[PDB]
Amino acid sequence: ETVAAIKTLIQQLAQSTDQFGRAEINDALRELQYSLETPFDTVMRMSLDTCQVAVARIGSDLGLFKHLSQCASPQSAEELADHLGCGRELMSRLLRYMASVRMVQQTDDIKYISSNITQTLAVPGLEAGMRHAFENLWPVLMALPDFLAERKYPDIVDAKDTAFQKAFNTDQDCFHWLATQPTRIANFKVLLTDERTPNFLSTFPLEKELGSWSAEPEKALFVDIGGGMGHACIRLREKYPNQPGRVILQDLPPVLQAAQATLPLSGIESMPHNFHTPQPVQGAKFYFLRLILRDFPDHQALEILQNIVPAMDAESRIVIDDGVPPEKGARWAETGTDICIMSALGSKERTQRQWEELAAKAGLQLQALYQYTWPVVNAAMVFSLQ
Amino acid sequence: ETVAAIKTLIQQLAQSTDQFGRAEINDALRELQYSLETPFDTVMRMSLDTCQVAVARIGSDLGLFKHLSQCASPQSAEELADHLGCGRELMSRLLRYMASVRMVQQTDDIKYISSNITQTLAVPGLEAGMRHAFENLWPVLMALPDFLAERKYPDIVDAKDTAFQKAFNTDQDCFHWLATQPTRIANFKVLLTDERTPNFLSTFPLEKELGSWSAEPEKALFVDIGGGMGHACIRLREKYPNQPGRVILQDLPPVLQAAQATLPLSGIESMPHNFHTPQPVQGAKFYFLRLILRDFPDHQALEILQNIVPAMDAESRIVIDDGVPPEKGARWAETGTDICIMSALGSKERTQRQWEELAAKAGLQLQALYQYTWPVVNAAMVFSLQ
Numbered sequence: 001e002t003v004a005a006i007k008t009l010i011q012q013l014a015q016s017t018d019q020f021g022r023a024e025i026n027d028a029l030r031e032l033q034y035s036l037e038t039p040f041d042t043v044m045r046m047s048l049d050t051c052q053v054a055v056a057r058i059g060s061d062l063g064l065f066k067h068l069s070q071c072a073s074p075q076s077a078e079e080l081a082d083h084l085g086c087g088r089e090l091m092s093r094l095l096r097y098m099a100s101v102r103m104v105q106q107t108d109d110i111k112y113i114s115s116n117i118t119q120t121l122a123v124p125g126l127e128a129g130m131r132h133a134f135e136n137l138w139p140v141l142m143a144l145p146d147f148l149a150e151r152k153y154p155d156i157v158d159a160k161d162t163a164f165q166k167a168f169n170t171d172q173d174c175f176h177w178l179a180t181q182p183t184r185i186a187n188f189k190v191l192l193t194d195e196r197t198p199n200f201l202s203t204f205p206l207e208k209e210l211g212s213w214s215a216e217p218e219k220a221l222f223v224d225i226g227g228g229m230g231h232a233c234i235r236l237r238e239k240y241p242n243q244p245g246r247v248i249l250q251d252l253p254p255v256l257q258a259a260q261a262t263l264p265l266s267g268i269e270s271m272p273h274n275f276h277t278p279q280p281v282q283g284a285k286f287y288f289l290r291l292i293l294r295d296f297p298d299h300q301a302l303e304i305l306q307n308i309v310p311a312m313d314a315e316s317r318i319v320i321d322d323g324v325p326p327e328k329g330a331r332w333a334e335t336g337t338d339i340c341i342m343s344a345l346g347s348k349e350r351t352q353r354q355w356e357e358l359a360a361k362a363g364l365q366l367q368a369l370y371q372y373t374w375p376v377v378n379a380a381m382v383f384s385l386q
Numbered sequence: 387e388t389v390a391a392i393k394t395l396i397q398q399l400a401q402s403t404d405q406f407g408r409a410e411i412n413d414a415l416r417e418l419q420y421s422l423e424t425p426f427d428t429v430m431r432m433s434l435d436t437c438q439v440a441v442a443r444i445g446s447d448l449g450l451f452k453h454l455s456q457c458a459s460p461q462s463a464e465e466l467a468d469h470l471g472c473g474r475e476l477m478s479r480l481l482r483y484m485a486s487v488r489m490v491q492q493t494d495d496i497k498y499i500s501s502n503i504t505q506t507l508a509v510p511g512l513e514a515g516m517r518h519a520f521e522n523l524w525p526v527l528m529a530l531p532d533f534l535a536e537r538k539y540p541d542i543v544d545a546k547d548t549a550f551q552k553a554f555n556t557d558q559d560c561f562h563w564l565a566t567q568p569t570r571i572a573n574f575k576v577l578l579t580d581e582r583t584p585n586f587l588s589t590f591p592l593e594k595e596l597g598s599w600s601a602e603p604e605k606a607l608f609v610d611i612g613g614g615m616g617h618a619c620i621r622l623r624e625k626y627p628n629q630p631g632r633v634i635l636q637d638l639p640p641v642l643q644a645a646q647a648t649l650p651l652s653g654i655e656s657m658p659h660n661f662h663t664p665q666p667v668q669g670a671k672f673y674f675l676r677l678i679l680r681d682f683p684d685h686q687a688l689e690i691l692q693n694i695v696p697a698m699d700a701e702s703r704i705v706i707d708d709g710v711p712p713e714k715g716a717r718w719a720e721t722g723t724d725i726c727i728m729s730a731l732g733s734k735e736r737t738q739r740q741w742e743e744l745a746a747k748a749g750l751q752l753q754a755l756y757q758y759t760w761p762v763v764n765a766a767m768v769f770s771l772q
């Protein structure tokens with residue numbers, strides 16, 4: 001059949017390229033889908049695609065993805081239902097739906113095996129992002145249209161006056177509201193254990209950027225500001241095991257104690273630091289900010305940069321590792337993020353020119369930009385004092 | 387470039403087939419996307435694809451899609467913002483996101499024109515379907531995971547005990563509650579103006595099913611039970627304009643009122659009738675139920691059928707026009723519908739065997755099954771007395 005032939009050739013093209021080529025193919029397949037659906041199909045697609053997150057959250061509550069990924073033969077719906085404690089008819093209907101969207105696979109004797117998506121949802125860090133989206137993002141998006149209608153469609157600029165405050169009936173911003181929320185801290189801390197791949201070290205020419213700087217007598221090579229579990233520090237020490245200089249993970253105390261389990265015995269310091277205060281480490285080569293500034297409106301993002309600038313020597317650099325969407329033709333993964341951080345945080349995705357304008361207000365100029373993902377661009381941008 | 391070549395060749399294959407083949411290709415493109423995405427891509431897709439309904443809702447509130455679909459030239463974001471009463475920065479970011487998911491088209495000089503999806507969302511009945519998804523379906527899906535956990539995963543069979551009651555904090559079932567909400571019933575009435583295509587008359591062998599039936603003296607040929615705007619009656623009269631016999635649209639008076647604008651001035655009777663009460667028309671050739679019975683659990687669906695059966699002749703037929711999902715390999719459109727109607731109405735999609743089991747409890751037997759859509763199957767099922 002022509003359908004089998006299409007799948008075979010796209011599969012073969014996909015395996016004949018790298019992860020960025022496969023991402024480009026997937027965006028093309030998505031664009032083809034939208035161009036080819038009928039009007040009624042469009043409305044059905046938009047209506048039913050919301051089911052995926054709800055049904056993933058149920059499968060996660062039942063432990064279904066973890067169980068199915070460990071099974072060694074196809075499982076019947078009754079076997080899964082009786083094992084996980086689910087009603088037989090309910091489980092059979094959830095599995096039929098999951099099979100239709102490849103969350104599981106259905107065999108021709110109507111049994112079930114894991115798919116690539118089953119394996120994904122069984123990973124704690126990824127499972128946690130799905131649960132984050134259901135419990136924290138969905139309420140904000142559900143509130144955005146009426147929030148904007150009430151306020152007469154304002155440009156959102158303040159983290160304490162956006163859809164989040166209407167959706168959760170609070171007056172705090174996300175950061176502070178979450179502390180008051182037991183169940184959501186546990187999922188968030190699990191979320192921080194996910195490590196995105198690839199990372200900036202795949203294209204960052206660290207030796208070229210070192211240049212005229214010296215680690216002697218005891219200077220810091222790398223200060224990871226808000227570095228979470230410290231994945232950037234770990235990958236840096238791993239890739240450049242012979243480069244001298246302190247490598248310092250900076251974050252809040254509760255996150256730093258969680259990171260102790262995973263950090264190496266030696267080579268990475270843990271330093272409690274609130275990045276809304278002056279940077280304590282002086283003259284470091286790289287002050288590193290990964291997925292930090294995108295969570296803040298320009299006013300607060302600027303204050304974070306101004307808190308680092310007085311610690312910089314002439315050879316110091318601020319490295320912002322973040323999304324850099326293009327000026328036109330932006331893709332859904334970076335425009336969707338923009339709407340979400342608008343609605344929850346009052347912040348925004350920034351083009352290269354918007355990053356430069358923000359950094360110029362802190363006294364900085366862009367020296368170099370090292371993309372490491374495509375077609376949705378994440379880049380390490382290297383800034384020095386003007 | 388490979389991506390351009392894939393789009394060219396899929397587009398050419400799509401143009402060469404019919405709507406059923408294009409739907410087959412679209413399901414295959416979806417399956418390829420899901421198998422080719424990375425684990426991180428899966429979570430981002432699940433997370434962000436719900437932005438689409440939220441942003442469509444906003445563009446609907448602003449009249450954006452209706453406006454853009456009437457525009458004779460590309461519009462800048464500033465021109466749209468100022469025309470529609472939206473903040474310029476807000477409108478720019480919404481348009482960028484809409485273009486990235488083909489809800490509009492962005493030009494090379496960063497202006498905006500209608501896409502196929504813009505035109506769809508400008509259609510009142512299709513727009514109303516999207517607004518229904520946002521305001522009615524979304525809160526029920528949002529409530530389903532916690533509802534199932536509280537009741538430890540029951541099999542849902544009661545229309546007054548499902549996620550709908552939790553989501554809207556009421557003890558009414560969905561049908562009664564909707565009537566007490568003026569803006570929601572108003573949207574619903576616009577929703578009824580959308581006419582699905584193709585319809586059952588494309589494969590229904592009317593003359594063979596009629597045989598020698600005579601309309602003499604006063605008999606009805608076609609009774610459209612819960613017929614809405616009467617599309618099935620209108621199409622029947624248009625395709626067989628010389629077939630004698632009355633054609634009767636039965637619904638509740640508020641819906642029949644909205645139908646008068648569209649009905650032909652002669653040939654179709656509007657008869658108020660509650661299908662939970664005994665059927666007034668005796669001895670009709672066809673009692674027609676399109677997309678009625680899937681809205682009810684088996685007990686209440688049985689009673690609707692039992693209200694008709696005493697009116698039937700030996701020649702009378704009940705025609706159920708509804709989804710007939712396969713025993714295996716069902717598609718996302720028909721399984722996702724099953725999960726939505728579970729959560730909001732306590733009902734279910736039914737396989738052919740499940741329809742026959744239900745209809746036998748009313749003393750009916752299946753005589754013919756006429757599919758008219760593929761690969762998601764809708765069929766007219768013709769039942770007679772045992």
Ligand SMILES: Nc1ncnc2c1ncn2[C@@H]1O[C@H](CSCC[C@H](N)C(=O)O)[C@@H](O)[C@H]1O
Nearest residue numbers: 226227228251252255273274275276290291
């Ligand atoms: N005021 C503050 N001072 C220092 N760290 C903060 C902070 N507010 C939030 N954070 C931290 O900022 C991080 C945001 S997510 C961390 C992402 C990390 N840079 C990475 O790419 O791996 C969290 O670890 C959180 O604990």
Ligand SMILES: Nc1ncnc2c1ncn2[C@@H]1O[C@H](CSCC[C@H](N)C(=O)O)[C@@H](O)[C@H]1O
Nearest residue numbers: 612613614637638641659660661662676677
């Ligand atoms: N108790 C009742 N008696 C008669 N009609 C009812 C009813 N409850 C709901 N309805 C009607 O049933 C219809 C369901 S949707 C309409 C579907 C229609 N058969 C078609 O496909 O074209 C609505 O028009 C609604 O007004």
